[PDB]
Design a protein around this nucleic acid. Structure first.
Ligand SMILES: *[C@@H]1O[C@H](CO)[C@@H](O[C@@H]2O[C@H](CO)[C@@H](O[C@@H]3O[C@H](CO)[C@@H](O)[C@H](O[C@H]4O[C@H](CO)[C@@H](O)[C@H](O)[C@@H]4O)[C@@H]3O)[C@H](O)[C@H]2NC(C)=O)[C@H](O)[C@H]1NC(C)=O
Ligand SMILES: *[C@@H]1O[C@H](CO)[C@@H](O[C@@H]2O[C@H](CO)[C@@H](O[C@@H]3O[C@H](CO)[C@@H](O)[C@H](O[C@H]4O[C@H](CO)[C@@H](O)[C@H](O)[C@@H]4O)[C@@H]3O)[C@H](O)[C@H]2NC(C)=O)[C@H](O)[C@H]1NC(C)=O
Ligand SMILES: *[C@@H]1O[C@H](CO)[C@@H](O[C@@H]2O[C@H](CO)[C@@H](O[C@@H]3O[C@H](CO)[C@@H](O)[C@H](O)[C@@H]3O)[C@H](O)[C@H]2NC(C)=O)[C@H](O)[C@H]1NC(C)=O
Ligand SMILES: *[C@@H]1O[C@H](CO)[C@@H](O[C@@H]2O[C@H](CO)[C@@H](O[C@@H]3O[C@H](CO)[C@@H](O)[C@H](O)[C@@H]3O)[C@H](O)[C@H]2NC(C)=O)[C@H](O)[C@H]1NC(C)=O
Ligand SMILES: *[C@@H]1O[C@H](CO)[C@@H](O[C@@H]2O[C@H](CO)[C@@H](O[C@@H]3O[C@H](CO)[C@@H](O)[C@H](O)[C@@H]3O)[C@H](O)[C@H]2NC(C)=O)[C@H](O)[C@H]1NC(C)=O
Ligand SMILES: *[C@@H]1O[C@H](CO)[C@@H](O[C@@H]2O[C@H](CO)[C@@H](O[C@@H]3O[C@H](CO)[C@@H](O)[C@H](O)[C@@H]3O)[C@H](O)[C@H]2NC(C)=O)[C@H](O)[C@H]1NC(C)=O
Ligand SMILES: *[C@@H]1O[C@H](CO)[C@@H](O[C@@H]2O[C@H](CO)[C@@H](O[C@@H]3O[C@H](CO)[C@@H](O)[C@H](O)[C@@H]3O)[C@H](O)[C@H]2NC(C)=O)[C@H](O)[C@H]1NC(C)=O
Ligand SMILES: *[C@@H]1O[C@H](CO)[C@@H](O[C@@H]2O[C@H](CO)[C@@H](O[C@@H]3O[C@H](CO)[C@@H](O)[C@H](O)[C@@H]3O)[C@H](O)[C@H]2NC(C)=O)[C@H](O)[C@H]1NC(C)=O
Ligand SMILES: *[C@@H]1O[C@H](CO)[C@@H](O[C@@H]2O[C@H](CO)[C@@H](O)[C@H](O)[C@H]2NC(C)=O)[C@H](O)[C@H]1NC(C)=O
Ligand SMILES: *[C@@H]1O[C@H](CO)[C@@H](O[C@@H]2O[C@H](CO)[C@@H](O)[C@H](O)[C@H]2NC(C)=O)[C@H](O)[C@H]1NC(C)=O
Ligand SMILES: *[C@@H]1O[C@H](CO)[C@@H](O[C@@H]2O[C@H](CO)[C@@H](O)[C@H](O)[C@H]2NC(C)=O)[C@H](O)[C@H]1NC(C)=O
Ligand SMILES: *[C@@H]1O[C@H](CO)[C@@H](O[C@@H]2O[C@H](CO)[C@@H](O)[C@H](O)[C@H]2NC(C)=O)[C@H](O)[C@H]1NC(C)=O
Ligand SMILES: *[C@@H]1O[C@H](CO)[C@@H](O[C@@H]2O[C@H](CO)[C@@H](O)[C@H](O)[C@H]2NC(C)=O)[C@H](O)[C@H]1NC(C)=O
Ligand SMILES: *[C@@H]1O[C@H](CO)[C@@H](O[C@@H]2O[C@H](CO)[C@@H](O)[C@H](O)[C@H]2NC(C)=O)[C@H](O)[C@H]1NC(C)=O
Ligand SMILES: O=C(O)CC[C@H](CP(=O)(O)O)C(=O)O
Ligand SMILES: O=C(O)CC[C@H](CP(=O)(O)O)C(=O)O
Ligand SMILES: [Ca+2]
Ligand SMILES: [Ca+2]
Ligand SMILES: [Cl-]
Ligand SMILES: [Cl-]
Ligand SMILES: [Zn+2]
Ligand SMILES: [Zn+2]
Ligand SMILES: [Zn+2]
Ligand SMILES: [Zn+2]
Lengths: 693, 693
RNA sequence: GGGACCGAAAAAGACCGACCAACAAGCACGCCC
RNA sequence: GGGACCGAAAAAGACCGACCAACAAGCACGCCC
């Protein structure tokens, strides 16, 4: 087996060295330091033995705090005395006190503002938290500064929900409930967030546009850019993140209504009152934000490496992950970048020996991912036609670890059998599973709710570089990392903090680098099999199985309004019919895939094209309603949470909060249109697996 | 040569028989007679030896006059006496007096109405005729019934221009200037239009949508249909066509301003006054329209025949033309349908002998073409994914003859060398070119203004079934017919009339059926070479050459406003750069295409894919501004004339009547955006011919 | 035969830039003499 | 230890239709006894 040779070349010691190398200085997007690391990686990928390695540059809107006018929040009395100020920077950790160019905590793409007003606590600032605030508790965030805890949903959605509720400011904070694991110590004595720690992060609502100034087209030297006024997904109110020390100061004086229930209570010793404003004596004190961050068009650099295929060089398997970090990127993304580096070194050594993959492999070091997947998206916009004609698969390589418990896999159903087979051939690195397969340890620790005796594999939404490839271009996509046990949908405590260091990983997450090595074997083994298997390792029958579940589910969600379904003759008959047809046609294609002569290079290429193009058949060039860059009809991010994936997203969005809609007849009409589009698309996808003539 | 064998099987006597067979009763879209002819063709294509022949049906909006409430126009006095009525039907021709189910003259998809008002003569009802009316002559069509002569532009554009000018009715008539050739006799004694003859035809503005009720998706059994109120491209005022006898009655009494110049004067003995209203005594007489036509969802039937390829069955060459007619379709479309039938019979005989084409050939008998390319477009919407993945080329087969002078070819630059080579190997059927090539007779009678010693090949716009394939899906497309000498952009006198018969073709156009045979050799030979050549016969260097002409042209058109170009820094630098790059890359790809080993089936398929997908690279999924179904960045129909093709249509539309625009800065900004999109698209297309890895 | 207007890129055709660092503007077909 | 509110499909998980011709609704984790 040529794969074992590849897997056995992968070394935890190499991953450890590369991780150390990538995490000693910050590599913020648009800074000289990240350009220097780009050039280092280009130079090393050549040395490692790639056929070519180019820098692809774009000029994209980034966001930076003003160094000589810092961002801070104040409690301010009616005399205008700033009696309490939030931190200007995170207290640096041991052996990082002398490190310059650490960007202070800030919300990227915040507008400028000095708004002052009454504080309203809005929990996680989810759609349902504003439904609870405004519909149930009759509280009105209009003209108020909202304070929200990080977690559950993408922070950009929180800011969007806040804007729609009339807020003039958003304060984001990390609550210990969400970012402090019980009975482990603050950094540097453990992996928990200290009270001065702050999660940086962008607050855009791009819905897959990439660079806000150049939607649809690469941000090249001659690009026509939108005015900032019509730029895509910019927030319209100021936003700033703080730690829980600073957050306790703002929250302790809160008056107005008590929290409705336990779902609104964090772990600080404060009442978690909703407001608006402060209790009793303090009622005439306000909160005032001071945001002077600037948006500016800055050059970014993707590293693109090529290992040309010996047989099908016009078929591309892509292994891509970002290089840019908020500070050191100890986990996010250098734990992924270090795995990609060792995978390149290892494919490189096989190349020097005189081995080549069947299909071309592309390796990508993406830039400006933290600013909204900007490097991956601009490159895909530049190369969309080649990618749609030639793209076999995309394997993501962000953070390798967010925990040390078990494997977490999100991929297209086309990769389910590949992932099952591979993890059965890999050793588990898990305590008490010595001599067992990764499949067994994974299936045991994370069983599928959907499939008895199978491991959980989740849906792809967005919030990483795979998005343009999968959701816009319909290229089969996969990601795998090590994760914690499920506190849930919050992340890891030290996410986007200065405390996210080399030492955090080495001391607390993966001292042996065995989890890193297992993830390198999963990502690398998947790339290997996609690039080298004679018949592409995609099982169309796994798509058939999940399409029936998604159809059962979307019917079930519509059935929340079963009287309306009757009034407006809402039928899923066409959708169930299409799924039944896909199942039958996939079954017959599978017979032909087993039977045919794989020595016939022309019949092989035909059947490989049918497999490669199956994911493309789910792409609608018109896109989903009000989201033209989300074109996959089976999968899209939640409108309300970029991180979360929905099945039959067109129907799902049409159904969401439908009982609120003023014109029932039109709203249910849109539901029936989306059933039509979905049934048509499933039948069309099925027909690509039919006999070609 | 296997092609000669195919060409020598084609027989003029067979085409004559089939033409007779297809033109004895009307075959209007949606009628039992056209269903019967569909089934006949399905049955004969099987007998001829196709591997399979299916009927593909759709339920589309068609339009019919009410049989028991006829359409007519009246001159009406202030007492409300209808003193003059227009014809209720065309006087039938000799030997057609006893023929039932001849649809009376009507404008398909006219709304219902009995509007009464003053007549304004608006010439051809072109954009420039309303600019002349409203800007120069200060005449105001608001609330007036407009009368317009057929010709120059698609009648649907005339109705659109009229609606935008505030007209409440449109009367279309055939002026002898445009539809009566000097010194030839009216049917049946010649090929000229008699004074009772009327051109039927649809008046939609679909801009490539297909069925008005189901834009983007096939009109299948479970389709969600728009309300008639939001249906695509329906006219909002009543419209009716009349002959020149009836038109003289309406035009003779016209008062108001004289015609501005000779360009407004037809050939009737009337003054061609503009109005509004009638002269002197007659000023209080009005015109009143009576339209009771109904729109209704009707089943239509495409015939789809397959000849599976022996080597690349997943590569499709399509030969398609419509079957539906306004009445007998003596020319339009049965002169084309009869050529397709003989091409099928001939491919069929080769199949029986045991020959197969390398690539699959699809044969299509399209329905409801006269109602807006509805059959071709719904089928393409159903099969868009297969067509984009597998479609090599589309050859149209509407009317084979509109004249007996020379060849007329409109195709992608990718087919220029194929067409040159083929016409050099075919005999000219032309008087005084006995023993010469069709290339020589054609080049002589129709020299290229663009290329010394080359024949004219024009651009594809719309107004036929190739549109969805080329303008929406980016499949390389071609058409060839015999045409008149250039009276121009009017058609042939008996177009869409009851007088367009078998006898018209047999007596006056092509008694020997030698023009039909030459067109069958061109269409059939092109299909043959596309389906059978080892290397696809596309020369990318012909695209390079024309892209430089189009760039020179669009620069030239922008330079009408050269001061504004400076004020707003409008530069074509990027566009010229992209074209220079395409030229260089196409030149190198051409070297590699000549050098490589064609015995390597995998290197051949790679290079054939690069050629096949080159046309697809010009497709923008976002579509052109305000025209989402026109996605080709190099070619689109004129916004003002569906029949006419524009190069760099995005830039062209942005520049059109720019000096009228209230915000110069925004309008010129859109021009710069379209330069950007065009340069990006040309560079992207060029890069698909680069080495793949 | 001669003359007058026009034909707003499907230019119908032919041809023609440094006191906007080569791609505007400007000689067949169909009321007067 | 027991109890109470909540967790609005990434359902966290398990399980459960003819006086809307099988796919609503309805038993782990984080003030009172
Ligand atoms: C993941 O792993 C699963 C489990 O192994 C795997 O499924 C299996 O794939 C193999 C390989 O195609 C299947 O093998 C075949 O079985 C059928 C009978 O059911 C045989 O007809 C096939 O015939 C062979 O004979 C040819 C003679 O010309 C040989 O040259 C040729 O190589 C064939 O081996 C063949 O034996 C097997 O049936 C399945 N098993 C199951 C339970 O499905 C799957 O392919 C892997 N998936 C991915 C995406 O990697
Ligand atoms: C339309 O017609 C034109 C005019 O014929 C045609 O262009 C020609 O195509 C041929 C076929 O490819 C070209 O032939 C080649 O010329 C180059 C030298 O310039 C040679 O290197 C090529 O080599 C051959 O040697 C191989 C040995 O392994 C042979 O096996 C192989 O078959 C090759 O023949 C070859 O001779 C020719 O140069 C051009 N001529 C011109 C003027 O361009 C064009 O291909 C046709 N286009 C379409 C779309 O049909
Ligand atoms: C991460 O690792 C890379 C790769 O080893 C380090 O960069 C490299 O550092 C080496 C050794 O110091 C450099 O070699 C030297 O360069 C200097 C100046 O050009 C020269 O005078 C010396 O004689 C020696 O040859 C090398 O330039 C450089 N390699 C690359 C590809 O950039 C990098 O500094 C490490 N980073 C951290 C933070 O540890
Ligand atoms: C929170 O931060 C703000 C801003 O840094 C602090 O308020 C500021 O305090 C400075 C220094 O005392 C004030 O400046 C002074 O102004 C007078 C002239 O008017 C000058 O002569 C003094 O010598 C002094 O420099 C400034 O007015 C004031 N600004 C604002 C907007 O409040 C605030 O004190 C901090 N709060 C805490 C609790 O630390
Ligand atoms: C899945 O595959 C099946 C089987 O090929 C498809 O079934 C077909 O469904 C349509 C109805 O949607 C049937 O079409 C016709 O409808 C008219 C209605 O007036 C009727 O007159 C015709 O006789 C015919 O019934 C068609 O018969 C039926 N075919 C079979 C064999 O059942 C189905 O539509 C596919 N699903 C999707 C979503 O495409
Ligand atoms: C155009 O040509 C077609 C093909 O020849 C004509 O239709 C066909 O007419 C033949 C000869 O009349 C039919 O054969 C006969 O059918 C009847 C009734 O089914 C049967 O009783 C006779 O013994 C004889 O077999 C044949 O059905 C039919 N073929 C097809 C494929 O439709 C058609 O009528 C011609 N149309 C015109 C307007 O000339
Ligand atoms: C143009 O066509 C219209 C409609 O066919 C003609 O006008 C119509 O003429 C009929 C027959 O004379 C009129 O009907 C009559 O009505 C009275 C009762 O009111 C009845 O007793 C008579 O016996 C007669 O049938 C009808 O009113 C009238 N309709 C309209 C809308 O005008 C018109 O005469 C035709 N014009 C020419 C020049 O042929
Ligand atoms: C057609 O192909 C040429 C040749 O590869 C492409 O040329 C490249 O054009 C860009 C400018 O648009 C140059 O990029 C860079 O711009 C920054 C500006 O700050 C500058 O700092 C860099 O040094 C660099 O000049 C690039 O140098 C240039 N390459 C060459 C070899 O001339 C051209 O863009 C392609 N055309 C299109 C439309 O893609
Ligand atoms: C960062 O903040 C500083 C200080 O407020 C800004 O510097 C000022 O710039 C404007 C000129 O545009 C001047 O009016 C002020 O006098 C400047 N002040 C100082 C101390 O230099 C600076 O422009 C900001 N940087 C940005 C917006 O990028
Ligand atoms: C929530 O409070 C806001 C802010 O006071 C209300 O908006 C205003 O309502 C008045 C009366 O209709 C308008 O005339 C003002 O223009 C609004 N003020 C601002 C600053 O926008 C809002 O109506 C309240 N919403 C609810 C649902 O009670
Ligand atoms: C690495 O793995 C260890 C061992 O599983 C994790 O520590 C345990 O966490 C559980 C509950 O999640 C506690 O009940 C135990 O007290 C811990 N076990 C031991 C042996 O200490 C640790 O949390 C993991 N590290 C990270 C960063 O996730
Ligand atoms: C065609 O026109 C006739 C005559 O005007 C229409 O027939 C009428 O239909 C309505 C019922 O919808 C009745 O009110 C009238 O009494 C009918 N008249 C006659 C003589 O039958 C017919 O509906 C029209 N056809 C259409 C619209 O398709
Ligand atoms: C052309 O005539 C129409 C119709 O009379 C004019 O439109 C009307 O103008 C008045 C005065 O502004 C409006 O109040 C009416 O509502 C219009 N009437 C209708 C029936 O629409 C129109 O303004 C004239 N256009 C020009 C450019 O002179
Ligand atoms: C078929 O071809 C004939 C011969 O070219 C066409 O008739 C001539 O038309 C020219 C001008 O266009 C006249 O000057 C001659 O009087 C005609 N020649 C002869 C020999 O009569 C005829 O128009 C063509 N038929 C059609 C339908 O286009
Ligand atoms: O903007 C996005 O889509 C996500 C960016 C980034 C993803 P990462 O933190 O890099 O996993 C974030 O969540 O802040
Ligand atoms: O609607 C169209 O695009 C054109 C239909 C038809 C084309 P044809 O007459 O069939 O050439 C017409 O012009 O009326
Ligand atoms: Ca972009
Ligand atoms: Ca449609
Ligand atoms: Cl990842
Ligand atoms: Cl045609
Ligand atoms: Zn990341
Ligand atoms: Zn991140
Ligand atoms: Zn036609
Ligand atoms: Zn027609």
């Amino acid at each position: 087996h040529n794969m074992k040779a590849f897997l056995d070349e992968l070394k935890a010691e190499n991953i450890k060295k590369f991780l150390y190398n990538f995490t000693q200085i910050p590599h913020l997007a648009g800074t000289e330091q990240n350009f220097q690391l780009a050039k280092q990686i280009q130079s090393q990928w050549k040395e490692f033995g790639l056929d070519s390695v180019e820098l692809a540059h774009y000029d994209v809107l980034l966001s930076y705090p003003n160094k000589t006018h810092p961002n801070y929040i104040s409690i301010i009395n009616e005399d205008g005395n700033e009696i309490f100020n939030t931190s200007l920077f995170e207290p640096p950790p041991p052996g990082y006190e002398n490190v310059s160019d650490i960007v202070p905590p800030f919300s990227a793409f915040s507008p400028q503002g000095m708004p002052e007003g009454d504080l309203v606590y809005v929990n996680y600032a989810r759609t349902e938290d504003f439904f609870k605030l405004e519909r149930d508790m009759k509280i009105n965030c209009s003209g108020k500064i909202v304070i929200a805890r990080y977690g559950k949903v993408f922070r950009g959605n929180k800011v969007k929900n806040a804007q729609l509720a009339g807020a003039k400011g958003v304060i984001l904070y990390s609550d210990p409930a969400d970012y402090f694991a019980p009975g482990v110590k603050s950094y540097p004595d453990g992996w928990n967030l200290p009270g001065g720690g702050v999660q940086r992060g962008n607050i855009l609502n791009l819905n897959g546009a990439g660079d806000p100034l150049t939607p649809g087209y690469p941000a090249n030297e001659y690009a026509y850019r939108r005015g900032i006024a019509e730029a895509v997904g910019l927030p319209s109110i100021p936003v700033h993140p703080i730690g829980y020390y600073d957050a306790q100061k703002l929250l302790e004086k809160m008056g107005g209504s008590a929290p409705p229930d336990s779902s609104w209570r964090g772990s600080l010793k404060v009442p978690y009152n909703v407001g608006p404003g402060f209790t009793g004596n303090f009622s005439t004190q306000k909160v005032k934000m001071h945001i002077h961050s600037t948006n500016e068009v800055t050059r970014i650099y993707n590293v693109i490496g090529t290992l040309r295929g010996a047989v099908e060089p016009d078929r591309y398997v892509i292994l891509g992950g970002h290089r840019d970090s908020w500070v050191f990127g100890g986990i996010d993304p250098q734990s992924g970048a270090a795995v990609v580096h060792e995978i390149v070194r290892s494919f490189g050594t096989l190349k020097k020996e005189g081995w080549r993959p069947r299909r071309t492999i592309l390796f990508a070091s993406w830039d400006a991912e933290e600013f909204g997947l900007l490097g991956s998206t601009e490159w895909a916009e530049e190369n969309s036609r080649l990618l749609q004609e030639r793209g076999v698969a995309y394997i993501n390589a962000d953070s390798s670890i967010e925990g040390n418990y078990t494997l977490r896999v999100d991929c297209t159903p086309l990769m389910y059998s590949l992932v099952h087979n591979l993890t059965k051939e890999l050793k588990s690195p898990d305590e008490g599973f010595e001599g067992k397969s990764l499949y067994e340890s994974w299936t045991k620790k994370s069983p599928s709710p959907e499939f008895s005796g199978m491991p959980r594999i989740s849906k792809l939404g967005s919030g990483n570089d795979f998005e343009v490839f999968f959701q816009r271009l319909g290229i089969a996509s996969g990601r795998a990392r090590y994760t914690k046990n499920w506190n849930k949908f919050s992340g890891y405590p030290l996410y986007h903090s200065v405390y996210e260091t080399y030492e955090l990983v080495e001391k607390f997450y993966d001292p042996m680098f065995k989890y890193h090595l297992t993830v390198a074997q999963v990502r690398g083994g998947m790339v290997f099999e996609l690039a080298n298997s004679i018949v592409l390792p995609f099982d169309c029958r796994d798509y058939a199985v999940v399409l029936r579940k998604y159809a059962d589910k979307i019917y079930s969600i519509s059935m929340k309004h079963p009287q309306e379904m009757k009034t407006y003759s809402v039928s899923f008959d066409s959708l169930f019919s299409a799924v039944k047809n896909f199942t039958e046609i996939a079954s017959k294609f599978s017979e032909r895939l087993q039977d045919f002569d794989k020595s016939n290079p022309i019949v092989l290429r035909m059947m490989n094209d049918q497999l490669m193009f199956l994911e493309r058949a789910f792409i609608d060039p018109l896109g989903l309603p009000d989201r033209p860059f989300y074109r996959h009809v089976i999968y899209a991010p939640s409108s309300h949470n970029k991180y979360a994936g929905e099945s039959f997203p067109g129907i799902y969005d049409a159904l969401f909060d439908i009982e609120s809609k003023v014109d029932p007849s039109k709203a249910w009409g849109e539901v029936k249109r989306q059933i039509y589009v979905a049934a048509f698309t499933v039948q069309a996808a099925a027909e690509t697996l039919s006999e070609v003539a």
